[PDB]
From a paper:
Type 1 pili are important virulence factors of uropathogenic [name] that mediate bacterial attachment to epithelial cells in the urinary tract. The pilus rod is comprised of thousands of copies of the main structural subunit [name] and is assembled in vivo by the assembly platform [name]. The pilus rod is a right-handed superhelical structure composed of ~3.2 subunits per turn with an axial rise between two consecutive subunits of 7.8 Å or 7.7 Å for the type 1 and P pilus rods, respectively. All subunits in the rod are connected via DSE, forming an exceptionally stable fold that is resistant to extreme temperatures, denaturants and mechanical stress.
Numbering used by the authors:
A (entry chain D), B (entry chain C), C (entry chain F), D (entry chain B), E (entry chain E), F (entry chain A): 2 to 159
Write the structure that this text describes.
Amino acid sequence: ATTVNGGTVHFKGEVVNAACAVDAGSVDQTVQLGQVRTASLAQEGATSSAVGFNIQLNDCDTNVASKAAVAFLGTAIDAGHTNVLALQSSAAGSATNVGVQILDRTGAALTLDGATFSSETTLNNGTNTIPFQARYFATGAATPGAANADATFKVQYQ
Amino acid sequence: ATTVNGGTVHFKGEVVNAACAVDAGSVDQTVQLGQVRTASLAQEGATSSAVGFNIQLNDCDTNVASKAAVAFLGTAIDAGHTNVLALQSSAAGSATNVGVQILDRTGAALTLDGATFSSETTLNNGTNTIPFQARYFATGAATPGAANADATFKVQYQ
Amino acid sequence: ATTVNGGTVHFKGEVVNAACAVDAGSVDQTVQLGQVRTASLAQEGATSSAVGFNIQLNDCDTNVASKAAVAFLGTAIDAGHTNVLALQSSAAGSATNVGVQILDRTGAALTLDGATFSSETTLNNGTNTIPFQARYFATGAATPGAANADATFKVQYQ
Amino acid sequence: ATTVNGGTVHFKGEVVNAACAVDAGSVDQTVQLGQVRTASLAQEGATSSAVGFNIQLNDCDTNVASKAAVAFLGTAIDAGHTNVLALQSSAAGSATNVGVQILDRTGAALTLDGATFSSETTLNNGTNTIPFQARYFATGAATPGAANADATFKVQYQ
Amino acid sequence: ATTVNGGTVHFKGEVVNAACAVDAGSVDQTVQLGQVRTASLAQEGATSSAVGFNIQLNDCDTNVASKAAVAFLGTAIDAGHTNVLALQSSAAGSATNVGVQILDRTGAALTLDGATFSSETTLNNGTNTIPFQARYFATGAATPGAANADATFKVQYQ
Amino acid sequence: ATTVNGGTVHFKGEVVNAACAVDAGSVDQTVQLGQVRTASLAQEGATSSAVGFNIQLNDCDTNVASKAAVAFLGTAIDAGHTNVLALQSSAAGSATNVGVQILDRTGAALTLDGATFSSETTLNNGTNTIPFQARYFATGAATPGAANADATFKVQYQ
């Protein structure tokens, strides 16, 4: 009877030629680091507590590839800290002298140039979950403010 | 009392003469399908795993209408595949020989002419959510690339 | 003294005109089914072991209504299997030729159209628990993969 | 090495002499109100349900100002309805006898002359968010159609 | 070997100059209130059962501050009901004549203006948990519909 | 069958001989920086917080090129600061003693002569995203006003 205009639906995805496929929940995910105190980030080299996040690989075929690694890409805080991600929320109110570090399963920070891959993880058939950690890294006396950062990752299958 | 120009706000919506009103989160929504492998789309008729998405109807009045169906409208991939969405990302980097299928609650792919409505769903008073699925449909050997599509829908009340 | 921006809280709920109200722990819930072997779903019509889940009704008034029934609404796997839920997780890595069946308190699989309600259960004043079961149903030789599914339910009072 | 013309980037922003700075997300935001039924706007004074939106203030310094208020500027629907936004999308297809009201944190509709400010909110150092609501206001029997509106705002720091 | 595009990760957090830091789970959290009957909200001042939620403070240093209090900020439902939240789901389908009240650990409803703080709770070193309650408050005869509300909070340390 | 003149459609594009093609969403993009306080740009060398923006590359073929770099072109603020974009919106209302800097993924401001390319990023097949940041740079005591700027970019595939 009564027909009414509704709305629109936008579909996002990607076709890849690879052993696995990144899960829909891992392609674009938000990691809540929570609040941190300036007293913790008092001087250069100070780190906060870590927050874990995962990249889940679906439909993995170990015949095609048995190892998977992840390289992250983003804007570094400066030239002397190539593994510290810079904060980019807005033009005002961001924290100063602090950035975000991404750790792979070996506990070491990853270079954010998109070429340095993480430690390879052996894959099984089906679902695979690559663990990662995120934490704040102080490049000096940290200043209060928002600390939001963004990075892209690419997966290597061997 | 320092007064400062702040910005601007744009309001979007629609007044409809219908038994239900589409929810604000369903009028415009993004469905993340995730990555898919070319090995799963190696020949015509090959489909992917489905991703669900809902259209929520608010303030439903069963005295006005008891059923609700949804018809989708979009660009078809071919003349013989009138139920497969074509991809619309950009002029480069898009996947080939693959499209998006919208499944109603019966599991059948809907025609995207804007006139073939879904299987009717009985409505209660108040909130109603109509389920749908999206999956990739291969029209041949799929090529790697971005797979983004979008469609509009209209709701019929009987 | 030192005041700091803390965060945000989101409140979700619903006001209904009904004899009972669904408990906050039953409006949305995750039912863990566990793993299942493909050897137990080797042909069409094969079913797995059942996992139980409950919908709790609070503040029931027997004067207003004495019996409660539940209907479930979700995407069906096929047109010949209108009582089998379709898997819904992501675009890659989900199991094929297998779905999820919801059983009412009589053991019969419920149709997922949202208009065929379960067996009516007599209610008492206050808390009421309506039992349900979920299991995997094979529409053929099932393949390995993720087996997630979602469905919404309606409550009818007489 | 192949050098190719890429494109253009446009940067928008504003320098202010104020205690706070409006966040980049609050400078130009779209508020999706969703659909509304005509039966909910059948006579003058009938309002719809509200949709919330925020204006975020960054880098707030309470030593400069401790309170913040917001005034909105837009085209009113009528002379006697100075707190109802007139709809403006195109020359055809718009709804009639209905507009948009902006409610401050006290729940009162704001006058849209750009001089009547909202209730002041105490500010803390750093990030501050000011809650607002939007709803449809009917000046008569609402007619179906598009219901888009636009309003600019300014922030007063005391 | 084979390298493919993955996805993107968004990190969200905040650096604060405070005695404690709000936990990652408390910065954003959804409180599920469940359903409520209209019969329990039949007149002004009628309240539903409370649902508990708590804000967790981490890395607390009792030398810096010994007590913490919370003030909530949201859109009030009326001028005479400053301690009752207003619903914000969509333009249609929301309940009328009912809001959300946030109760302190002393059982008193908090004023939603961001300046009236809760009762101070003495802090210990390490993890601290501030309990709160949420309930429905009726300003009249409540109407069936969705009841969703949003509130932001700030923490005071002294 | 009533036929009516409808309107006109303009198509903008470019054919390039390169390993990658710039995505339609990044050929002409608007970067909303937000607001900034004059107190944060009080003296020469003071910078604001950064805002991130990306240039997406499509249909990348690593057999043709494996590295990509971006150079930006625009009017500098003066001869001393060749890496600061001058502001341009109109004859009146622009901010004084402040410009816009573009940071590459290494966090270093780029020279705006159209020939100093950014740090090379390793490319994968298909979609590639090169990160960038924008921030305000004070050449003295900044004056309130509009702070819009425009720059073009070119991509070098080596």
